[PDB]
Description:
Two copies of one chain form a homodimer.
Chain A: H1 4-39, H2 47-55, H3 59-62, E1 69-75, H4 80-89, E2 98-99, E3 107-114, E4 125-126, H5 131-143, E5 147-148, E6 152-153, E7 163-172, H6 181-187, E8 188-197, H7 198-205, E9 212-218, E10 227-229, E11 242-248, E12 251-259
Helix pairs in contact in A: 1-7, 5-6
Subcellular location (chain A): Cell inner membrane
Protein name (chain A): histidine kinase
Organism (chain A): Xanthomonas campestris pv. campestris (strain 8004)
Amino acid sequence: ELERERRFDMVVRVLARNISERMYTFEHGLRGARGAVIGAGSDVISRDRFTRYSRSRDYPREFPGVLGYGYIHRVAAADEAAFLDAARADGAPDIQRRLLAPWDGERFIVLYFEPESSGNRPLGLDVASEPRRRIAAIAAARSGQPTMTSPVSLSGYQTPSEGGFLVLLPVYREGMPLQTPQQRMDATTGWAYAPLSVKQMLESTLGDRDDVAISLSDREDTQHTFYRSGIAAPESMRRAAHTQLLPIYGRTWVLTARPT
Amino acid sequence: RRFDMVVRVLARNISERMYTFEHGLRGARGAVIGAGSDVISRDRFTRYSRSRDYPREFPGVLGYGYIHRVAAADEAAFLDAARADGAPDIQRRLLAPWDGERFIVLYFEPESSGNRPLGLDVASEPRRRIAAIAAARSGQPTMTSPVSLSGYQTPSEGGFLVLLPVYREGMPLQTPQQRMDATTGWAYAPLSVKQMLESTLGDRDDVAISLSDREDTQHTFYRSGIAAPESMRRAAHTQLLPIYGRTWVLTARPT
Lengths: 260, 255
C-alpha cells in the first residue's frame, strides 16, 4: 500500500528532471547567440554577420522545442530614429517599432531573429512595451543570468494566440564594471533571446506520457496553468496530488501530477 | 474606414456564431424529450446524433452530448445500466476530488478521435458545476467561465461548455428551486476557444484583438494580432458581449 506513493514519487521526480533538462538545453544557443555579438565587438553585429552566424547553426536539430534565437537592442526614445535608419539601411527596409501595449519608456527592440521559417517575424517588436517581457529583460540585465518570463502570448510568432515564454540573456558593453545590479544594468547594450511555445517545448520532452495526468503553472500565479494533459485514475482522486517545484531561469514552475 | 464600426460588426459576429450553437442544444434536449420519462437509450441518442451533421451545421463547436444527474447513492445502479446499454468501459471520471452530487457525461457525439468524455463527472470541477446549476435554476443555456478541455484532446485546450437543462415532465418550474429539483440532466456542447474563433474570424488581419471573461479581466482566453504603432497613442476599442450568462470583454486595435 505504502510502496504506491513512493513508486509514483519516482515517476514525478523523473518527469520534473526531464522538463528542467529540456529547458536548460536552450541556454547553450542563448549563449551562442550572445557569443556572435561579443565576437562582433563594441559596434553591434551587422545583419550579414548575424545571419551568417544563424546559418552556421541548425536549431530544429540542435535545439528541438525552441522557436529560434535572436537579438534585442536597447535603444532610448531619443535614439529611435537613428537606430531605425541604420537598421533599414542594413537589410530590413520595412522595420518599425511595434508595441505590444502603450509604452513611452526606454525601448528594447527585436533587431535580429532566426529563423522566420519557424515562428514568425518579430522584427521591430518592442519587448519593453509589455511588462512580463520587460521584467525578464531587466532581471536578466541586473543578474547576468538567463531569465525567462511569466507565461505570455506569442505575438509575432503566428496568429492566433500561442502560449509561450521568452528567455533573455544580456550583452554587456566591454570595459564597464559588472560588480553590482545597477552597474550591470547601465552596462547592457542589448539581449540575446529565445522565444518558445509551451506546446512545442513540451512535445519533445513528454511525447506520449499517457501514464500521467499533469498540470504546469508559474508559482507567482498558480490559479492559471500554462499546460494541462490527461485525466487521472479516479482512485488517485481519493488522496492528494504529487507536487514538484521546478526552478527554471529565475522563475519557479509547479508540476502537479496523478497517475493515468 | 470607421474603426468604431469594424469593432461593432466584429462583436456581432462573435455573438452570432456563439448563439448558433443553441439550436443543437435544444435539438439534443429534444431527442431526450421524445424518449419521455425514462432516460434515452444509447441506440436512440446515437441515431439522433447520426441524423445531424455537426461540422457542417455548427462550425466552431466540438459536438453535442448529454449529461445525467445522479446522486452518490445511485452511482453504482446508474453505472450498471450504462455498461449493459453499450458502454462497457464506462466509470465515474473526476476532474478534481468531489464527494457531492454527480453530473456524469453519458453521451457525446462525435466520439471521433479525442472526444472521449464518457463518464466525466462535470460536477467534480467548480466552473463546470456553477454553469450547470445556473442553467438548471434559470432554465437558460448557460456557459462556463474559460476552462481546460480534458477529455477532448491529449494536451488540453482552452474552451467552454454550454449547458441547457432537462426537466422532469409534470414537475413545477415557477421558482429556481422548483426548476433545480425538476432537473434530470443537461444537453451540453464543449467548445474549443481556437476552433470557434477560427470559424468566425478566419484569415482577417485587419484587427489586433483580445478576449477575456469580465469575472477575471487579468486573464485573456484569446489574443491575436499586433496593433498599428499609432493606435497605441490612444486607448483600445472596448465592447462587452453577453454570452450565455457570461460577459466577454472584447478589446480591439486596428492592424
